[PDB]
């Protein structure tokens, strides 16, 4: 009512009609937000007083029940003992054992169970509310099926999804992902809550992979004429621009976003804190204050375009609240925990593909063949030799039907003229290259959860790593000593 009084008293002012409709829409959105805050307070007090009632039962009624039943159990035991002593058809030791066996300690009549009372005052209405409670304004879900792809919102808010038939479905990270290869494509998501407003917190969260190469191409737009927000490529990175209906702008350039690499973009706008957070992968990139940003009322349709750029978009999600750094990190690391070994590009690693080898310690030196003492190994390139081409690798599995590598997979590394294969010499505990497939070593491929695009080769519970410097060489060796750092046995395979 106070807000309505102020708005109606401000209607008698030198403000244009369009701005007045903007005020009315913003006030309606603020009323919805106030209702949401009131509901939050209501369930807060509900939980508080329910826990208070359970506590009062625990600390005010249960002791009285215990006292009363102790008094009763005294008489019960006395009567049982009297009855067992009146009988005279049994022995003495047997009678003592029987009377000791039929006794009533306190634990006999102790039935308190906090979980059994919490689950006893929760009704089917509470379960319905819990099931229908979702923190998502849009949770896009794609399902290839059999020759009939379906893209739809499964958040329960029923956003209207309009997409052309030129889009495809691939397997990007975890599940199917939209693939826009045909130029000038568009996917529109329509929902009332997407209109934003003066006071409402939200967050966009998706996976992006650009196959292009460097002009400014629009990626995601919600700009109604002037006001709104948008994300678009620029130079060699992204730009997130938010503009309100008063001229205030906020353009943030997120660098180090190059093509042929997966990126987990998470943008959060929290208007209770006047905070704008922008995470790329598992690292906070931007932390800005948007106190100068005001009503951003925009259209009810979020548009995803391609603009002559083949793009993979996965798990596009819009929430109705702000996200924290811990939650973003948890989502990013759990989304990649899917038993698939990835390459340095972020895509799935596959057998029978030309791959370049990199060590985690040296993210730019590619292993190259070295011949010495009539033996061929592979080693890091020296600092004086950086133009030497790296070695071409392939992974061979026992079954040729398998195409994608997985956790705990036995395989053989093949080097691309004589078709060399990896072997381990039990003279220097290094590796070498042989010309016999039967002489190769079946090594196990794995990866660490917190290093997703890196993998490890194991051979009887012994990781292969890089040795120390040796006259401008660093051979792969099967280490057993701890003097080599634990991060030196992480490798990366790059699609070459």
């Amino acid at each position: 009512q106070i807000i309505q009084n102020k708005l109606q008293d401000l209607f008698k002012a030198d403000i244009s009609m369009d701005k007045l409709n903007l005020m009315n829409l913003a006030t309606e959105k603020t009323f919805i937000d106030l209702s949401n805050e009131s509901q939050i307070a209501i369930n807060n007090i509900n939980d508080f007083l329910n826990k208070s009632a359970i506590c009062v039962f625990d600390t005010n009624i249960y002791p009285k029940f215990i006292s009363f039943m102790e008094q009763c159990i005294n008489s019960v035991n006395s009567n049982v003992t009297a009855f067992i002593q009146k009988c005279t058809n049994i022995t003495e030791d047997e009678k003592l054992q029987l009377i000791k066996l039929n006794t009533f300690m306190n634990i006999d009549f102790e039935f308190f169970d906090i979980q059994s009372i919490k689950d006893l005052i929760t009704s089917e209405t509470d379960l319905i509310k819990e099931e229908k409670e979702s923190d998502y304004n849009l949770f896009l879900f794609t399902l290839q099926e059999d020759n009939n792809k379906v893209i739809e919102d499964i958040s329960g808010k029923n956003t209207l999804v309009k997409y052309s038939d030129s889009i495809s479905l691939v397997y990007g990270v975890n599940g199917d992902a939209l693939y826009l290869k045909e130029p000038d494509e568009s996917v529109s998501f329509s929902n009332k809550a997407f209109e934003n407003g003066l006071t409402n917190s939200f967050s966009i969260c998706f996976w992006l992979r650009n196959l292009g190469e460097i002009i400014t191409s629009k990626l995601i737009e919600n700009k109604a004429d002037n006001c709104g927000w948008e994300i678009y490529f620029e130079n060699n990175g992204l730009v997130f621009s938010i503009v309100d209906c008063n001229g205030n702008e906020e353009n943030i350039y997120l660098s180090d976003v190059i093509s042929k690499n997966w990126y987990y973009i998470s943008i959060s706008i929290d208007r209770l804190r006047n905070q704008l957070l922008i995470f790329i992968n598992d690292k906070l990139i931007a932390n800005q204050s948007i106190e100068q940003i005001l009503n951003i009322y925009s259209s009810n349709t979020i548009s995803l375009v391609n603009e002559n750029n083949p793009i993979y978009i996965e798990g596009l999600s819009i929430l109705n609240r702000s996200i924290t750094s811990e939650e973003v990190v948890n989502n990013y690391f759990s989304y990649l925990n899917n038993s698939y070994i990835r390459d340095i590009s972020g895509e799935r690693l596959e057998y029978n593909k030309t791959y370049e080898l990199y060590n985690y310690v040296f993210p730019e030196n590619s292993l190259y063949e070295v011949t010495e003492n009539n033996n061929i190994y592979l080693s890091i390139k020296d600092t004086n030799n950086l133009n030497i081409q790296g070695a071409k690798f392939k992974l061979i599995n026992i079954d040729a039907n398998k195409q994608y590598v997985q956790k705990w997979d036995e395989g053989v590394v093949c080097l691309l003229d004589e078709e060399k294969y990896v072997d381990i010499s039990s003279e220097n505990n290094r590796i070498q290259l042989v010309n016999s497939k039967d002489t190769a070593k079946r090594i196990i491929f794995n990866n660490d959860i917190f290093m997703p695009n890196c993998l490890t080769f194991a051979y009887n519970n012994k990781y292969l790593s890089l040795s120390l410097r040796d006259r401008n060489y660093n051979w792969m060796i099967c280490n057993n000593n701890d003097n080599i750092p634990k991060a030196a046995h992480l490798w990366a395979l790059k699609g070459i």
Partner: protein, 148 residues
């Protein structure tokens, strides 16, 4: 508590928030309404006697501040350690529905006292009539007596 609940309601359209219940109920003009929103009242007193709002930016700022203060005020909770775990006590629960509203803070009185002090009718238990009949003395062997 019903008196406070009624006092938080007005039929007029030109009221003003007040933290004094006695002043609200003793107001002859009936222009004061009781409220526990300390943040909102403080903000409105701060902006009192200032430049009247005429521009759209000023109104947007005022609305945003009002919403932020209301959200901070209605969602105020303090986590205390109770015998059954952790309880998020609502801080303003003392002001509205006058209960343990003597002095200091509601959470301080709630912690020092128990949860029983919230309700106004305690010690309503009554022992139910208990009929535990004793065991009925015919002779029996060990197994039959054990089973009985």
């Amino acid at each position: 508590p019903i008196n406070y609940l009624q006092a938080q309601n007005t039929n007029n359209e030109k009221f003003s928030l007040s933290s004094d219940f006695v002043e609200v109920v003793s107001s002859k003009d009936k222009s004061l309404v009781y409220s526990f929103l300390s943040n909102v009242m403080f903000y409105l007193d701060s902006i009192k006697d200032n430049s009247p709002i005429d521009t759209d930016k000023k109104y947007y700022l005022w609305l945003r501040e009002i919403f932020r203060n209301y959200s901070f005020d209605i969602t105020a909770t303090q986590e205390i350690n109770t015998d059954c775990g952790i309880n998020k006590v609502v801080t303003w629960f003392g002001k509205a529905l006058n209960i343990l509203n003597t002095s200091d803070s509601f959470v301080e009185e709630f912690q020092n006292l128990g949860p029983i002090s919230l309700i106004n009718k305690k010690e309503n238990l009554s022992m139910p009539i208990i009929e535990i009949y004793g065991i009925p003395m015919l002779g029996l062997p060990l197994n039959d007596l054990n089973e009985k």
